[PDB]
From a paper:
The adenylate cyclase ([name]) toxin is a major virulence factor produced by [name], the causative agent of whooping cough, and is involved in the early stages of respiratory tract colonization. Once secreted by [name], [name] invades eukaryotic cells through an original molecular mechanism that involves a direct translocation of its N‐terminal adenyl cyclase catalytic (AC) domain across the plasma membrane. We have previously shown that a peptide, corresponding to the C‐terminus of the translocation region TR of [name], P454 (residues 454–484), exhibits membrane‐active properties related to antimicrobial peptides (AMPs): this peptide adopts a helical conformation upon membrane interaction and induces a local destabilization of the lipid bilayer. Here, we show that P454 is able to translocate across a lipid bilayer and binds with high affinity to calcium‐loaded calmodulin (holo‐[name]).
Initial attempts to crystallize the P454:[name] complex were unsuccessful. However, we obtained two distinct crystal forms of [name] in complex with a slightly shorter peptide, [name], corresponding to the residues 458–481 of [name] (i.e., shorter than P454 by 4 residues (ASAH) at N‐terminus and 3 residues (MTQ) at C‐terminus), and that displays an affinity for [name] similar to that of P454 (K d [name] = 240 nm). In both cases, several copies of [name] and [name] were present in the asymmetric unit. The superposition of these multiple copies yields an ensemble of [name]:[name] conformations (Supporting Infromation), which illustrates the well‐documented conformational plasticity of [name] due to its central helix flexibility. The structure of the P454:[name] complex presented above reveals several residues of P454 that might be critical for the interaction with [name], including the aromatic residue W458, the arginine residues R461 (R1) and R474 (R2), the aliphatic residues L463, L475, I479 and L481, and finally the histidine residue H477. Our data shows that the affinity of the P454‐derived peptides for [name] is mainly altered by mutations of arginine and aliphatic residues with a progressive decrease with the single point mutations L475A, R474Q, H477S, L463A and I479A or with the reduction of the side chain apolarity of the I479 residue (i.e., I479L, I479V, and I479A). These results confirm the contribution of these residues in the complex formation as suggested from the observation of the peptide:[name] crystal structure. Substitutions of aliphatic and histidine residues at the C‐terminus of P454 (H477S‐I479A and L475A‐H477S‐I479A) resulted in ≈20‐fold decrease of affinity of P454 for [name], while the mutation of the N‐terminal aromatic and aliphatic residues (W458A‐L463A) results in only a 4‐fold decrease in P454:[name] affinity. These observations are in agreement with the crystal structure of [name]:[name], showing that the residue H477, and more importantly I479, from the C‐terminal part of P454 are crucial for P454:[name] interactions.
Residue numbers in the entry:
A (entry chain B): 458 to 481
B (entry chain A): 3 to 148
């Protein structure tokens, strides 16, 4: 689907993990 | 050392807190995200959170301050996990207690030619509750001692 955007999905998952680690 | 994909993760996490886009994470936004994930804090807990990283004293978290907050949570969880992993190495049976036998076994496995009296001492000096065994809590207390 286009690695410039599906990479974006990977970075969305990365940022979400970071925000969980700060909430915890 | 630092990559653009890393900076992108940093930025996206910041914006997920800074939902309004003013460049600063207030206690309200910070609270709402924790709230949407279960755990509910008080504004005192929130203010302590901002306080630990408020380098400028402006009551909010700007980007470099969020970077520090991030690095500290990561390091905190890295140490907390190295301790969990070590504990699981010593507690050979998973019962949550390190026995004198288990410490004896692991230590001679590591090469440490300790006498029986040496392992009874290690056990006794980390045993707080005095049950002759070292539980996880006591393990942590020893691991992070000064
Ligand atoms: Ca904001
Ligand atoms: Ca503090
Ligand atoms: Ca600030
Ligand atoms: Ca055990
Ligand atoms: Ca104990």
């Amino acid at each position: 689907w286009g690695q410039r955007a599906l990479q974006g999905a990977q970075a969305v998952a990365a940022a979400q993990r970071l925000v969980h680690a700060i909430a915890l | 050392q630092l990559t653009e994909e890393q900076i992108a993760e940093f930025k996206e996490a910041f914006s997920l807190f800074d939902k309004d886009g003013d460049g600063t994470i207030t206690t309200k936004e910070l609270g709402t995200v924790m709230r949407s994930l279960g755990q509910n804090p008080t504004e005192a807990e929130l203010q302590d959170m901002i306080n630990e990283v408020d380098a400028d004293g402006n009551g909010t978290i700007d980007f470099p301050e969020f970077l520090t907050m991030m690095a500290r949570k990561m390091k905190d969880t890295d140490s907390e996990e190295e301790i969990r992993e070590a504990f699981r190495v010593f507690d050979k049976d998973g019962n949550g207690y390190i026995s004198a036998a288990e410490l004896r076994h692991v230590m001679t496995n590591l090469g440490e030619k300790l006498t029986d009296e040496e392992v009874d001492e290690m056990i006794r000096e980390a045993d707080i509750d005095g049950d002759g065994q070292v539980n996880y809590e006591e393990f942590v207390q020893m691991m992070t001692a000064k």
